[PDB]
Symmetry: C2
Subunit: 161 residues, 2 copies
Amino acid sequence: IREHLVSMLVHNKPGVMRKVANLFARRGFNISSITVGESETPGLSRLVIMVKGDDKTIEQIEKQAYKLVEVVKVTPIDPLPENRVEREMALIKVRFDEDKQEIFQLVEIFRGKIIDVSREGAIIEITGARSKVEAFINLLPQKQVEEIARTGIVAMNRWNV
Amino acid sequence: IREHLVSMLVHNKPGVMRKVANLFARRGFNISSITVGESETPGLSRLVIMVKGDDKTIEQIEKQAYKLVEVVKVTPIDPLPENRVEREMALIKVRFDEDKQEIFQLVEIFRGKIIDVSREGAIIEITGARSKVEAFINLLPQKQVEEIARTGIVAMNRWNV
Ligand SMILES: [Mg+2]
Ligand SMILES: [Mg+2]
């Protein structure tokens, strides 16, 4: 009923992602997005998970994650969009068809970056809220999009104001 | 012995990530990084995996992935760094300590973005090659880094030149 966001600090060693995927699958969790990479603490990874569910969802995930010994801190992200930041990044390969200029214009308007060009097309890098990224993707001529590689959402609570 | 990069298109439904994590764990694959999100084809996700291994590594992963019926295309990424693009994104929460100006300068030099500020600190968004992202993170006063949330690597082959 609402998408929820949770950040999670896990001891990083061989076999660990296998474990958290298992726990989430064999608990009936509807995961929409997952991000994973090094954290602020060397030796610990941070995962951001978005899960589609009800208001008991965050408690549930908390309770169940903590049963992996490797799960060392679970941090819910504020449900108020005003209280957090959310970002996604996409790499987009587009072929030109007499429209170099419309495409480059679009990249400029969205503050994207061209990171590869040939006579045939470009690769564009785009970062922003998920709805900026998607709005951008949808504005491209769909027959000309060759490839799209996307991260999930990274999110964090804002500084308290 | 070398890090290898592979892109992979998978049918996206409940239980799917569980499966590919299982196959990779119970095959002895040393996964350094994983990215996942929607692809250019609606209904299919694209995953980018980096795996530390020998020259048989890409074949192996190919052979073994294809045994999940949901794995629908495996694309190795060019091993020549000249032939591909690689990008990572990080969200970084930093506390100020009489050094607003050094920090903002640093963000400008790395073409990062300030996406949250208070009197206490900022959240910085940074995108680039993994060594630009890490060089940036290492340049911050380590006692002042509160939080770091990172995607893995997204990668793609360049247009043929
Ligand atoms: Mg514990
Ligand atoms: Mg098949």
